[PDB]
Design a protein around this ligand. Structure first.
Ligand SMILES: *[C@@H]1O[C@H](CO)[C@@H](O[C@@H]2O[C@H](CO)[C@@H](O[C@@H]3O[C@H](CO)[C@@H](O)[C@H](O)[C@@H]3O)[C@H](O)[C@H]2NC(C)=O)[C@H](O)[C@H]1NC(C)=O
Ligand SMILES: *[C@@H]1O[C@H](CO)[C@@H](O[C@@H]2O[C@H](CO)[C@@H](O[C@@H]3O[C@H](CO)[C@@H](O)[C@H](O)[C@@H]3O)[C@H](O)[C@H]2NC(C)=O)[C@H](O)[C@H]1NC(C)=O
Ligand code: NAG
Lengths: 48, 45
């Protein structure tokens, strides 16, 4: 019955850190560009 | 061929923004306070 949100006045820099706190994949939703850094990308369907 | 003779003249053939408004997200405005002087009063009594 409600929509969970995430907001900010700036970038939302979703990232992942290894045990050494080093970035491996990143997803930065900024004001102008939505970057998806990483080692890959995929889009699958339900059946695979 | 006179049957497919075509005549054409002039005619009169005559056929970006981005914005979204949320409601609010203000941070901790006026970020300053202290808990010593009042503590000094209530431990000096
Ligand atoms: C994603 O989820 C949210 C929350 O369920 C959806 O927002 C909802 O959208 C409907 C359709 O407009 C709202 O119903 C009507 O909204 C108008 C304001 O535009 C209001 O004046 C009416 O009285 C009526 O409520 C509903 O309120 C709104 N929910 C919330 C919590 O804001 C949204 O539509 C969903 N996305 C998609 C693509 O369906
Ligand atoms: C928030 O997200 C935006 C969009 O991804 C970031 O803007 C981009 O930031 C990069 C890195 O700061 C900029 O690259 C820079 O390019 C200049 C040459 O133009 C170079 O000299 C710098 O060393 C750097 O590589 C990029 O230009 C910039 N693009 C835009 C359209 O703004 C922004 O940095 C992010 N901010 C934060 C705090 O994460
Ligand atoms: C015009 O040429 C086409 C192709 O040969 C022909 O089918 C058509 O009948 C011609 N039109 C007339 C009015 O002869």
């Amino acid at each position: 019955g409600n929509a969970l949100y995430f907001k900010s006045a700036r970038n939302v820099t979703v990232n992942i850190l290894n045990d050494q706190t080093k970035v491996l994949t990143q997803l930065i939703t900024g004001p102008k560009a939505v970057e998806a850094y990483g080692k890959k990308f995929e889009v699958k369907t339900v059946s695979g | 061929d006179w049957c497919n003779v075509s005549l054409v003249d002039t005619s009169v053939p005559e056929p970006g923004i981005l914005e979204h408004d949320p409601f609010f997200c203000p941070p901790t405005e006026a970020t300053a306070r202290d808990f010593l002087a009042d503590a000094l009063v209530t431990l000096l009594v």
